[PDB]
Design a protein around this ligand. Structure first.
Ligand code: NA
Ligand code: NA
Ligand code: NA
Lengths: 198, 197
């Protein structure tokens, strides 16, 4: 729907300037041409608009990172392919992530916002798991691999979250590519440790 | 002064009840019995109160984690009982950190808030660095140790940030002690990787 997109485009731009609080549904109308009644019929409220806008930025973020099956064979080893793309996006410091971390830390979340935060978070965790399953030896029993992959995934997600905060709070001195390289090296060392933990 | 602590205690209770937006200086006065003029005279504005409030929360968080020169014998190494305390605090999932992360992701921050967020962040980084310097072999040249410690510290700080979000967004399934244990294991493995360039 093209009418949905103009509302979100208007809201993005309007929130880039002016902030969320100082932006009125009226202001959104002025920008996108859709009447307030029309905006409500779509997203239900002002918070509903931010929710849908947040979810859109997510899909664009994730679509720029290839799934394991979308990368090639292995080359360079192909978990590396994903890492390269993740590094690329993260090095550009996406403001989408700023919003995600902000909204996930807010008390009294709007139900629509809470659902979107939950889904984006689950997708992120899923995308990491998709990549990390292929880092384990072929001969691990499925139940054991599940445990190890899960614990490795939580570790990767945690480090990746912290990389954004590094890039945010230490933008001048933070090397994103280097930090993610340490993660890949950390994961490689942890795999034997986890497999033999009884 | 006792006057400052009553304002902050009252503000602490008001946000977590009505939240920051729905709380007024008048509400703060009603709770602590200090006139708005007195409150302004201390913190200058409503944002000034929030700043001082969460900075207080930071000091209580850090004072509960021993530095290297506290945390006595043996020389263990000492980062284990440091880690134990860090795990203990994080296991309780303090709301201080939620506020820190929230204020750190905001644009158009009040000047007082920005200064406090930066100080808390620098203090955290410094406390990690203080502990991690002792994980290296002693025969490492000071300049190389500087780089390795700094890179290890940023890694630890990053993981430790991620642990809070795991505890916050996956509270049922997140094992905090186990995560921080992986970190210590990760750091130890990374220590030679970094030294050999
Ligand atoms: Na908001
Ligand atoms: Na606020
Ligand atoms: Na520590």
């Amino acid at each position: 729907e093209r009418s949905r997109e103009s509302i979100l485009d208007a809201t993005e731009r309007l929130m880039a300037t002016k902030g969320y609080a100082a932006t009125s549904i009226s202001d959104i109308r002025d920008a996108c041409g859709l009447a307030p009644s029309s905006i409500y019929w779509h997203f239900g409220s002002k918070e509903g608009v931010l929710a849908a806008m947040m979810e859109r930025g997510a899909q664009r973020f994730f679509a720029a990172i290839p799934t394991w099956d979308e990368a090639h064979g292995p080359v360079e080893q192909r978990s590396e392919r994903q890492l390269t793309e993740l590094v690329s996006l993260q090095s550009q410091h996406p403001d989408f992530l700023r919003l995600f971390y902000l909204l996930s830390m807010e008390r009294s979340q709007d139900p629509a916002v809470a659902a979107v935060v939950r889904r984006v978070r689950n997708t992120a965790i899923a995308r990491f798991r998709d990549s990390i399953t292929h880092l384990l030896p072929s001969d691990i029993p499925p139940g054991k691999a599940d445990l190890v992959v899960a614990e490795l995934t939580a570790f990767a997600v945690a480090l990746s979250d912290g990389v954004y905060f590094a890039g945010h709070l230490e933008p001048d001195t933070t090397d994103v590519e280097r930090m993610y390289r340490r993660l890949r090296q950390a994961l490689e060392a942890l795999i034997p440790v986890l497999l033999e933990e009884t």
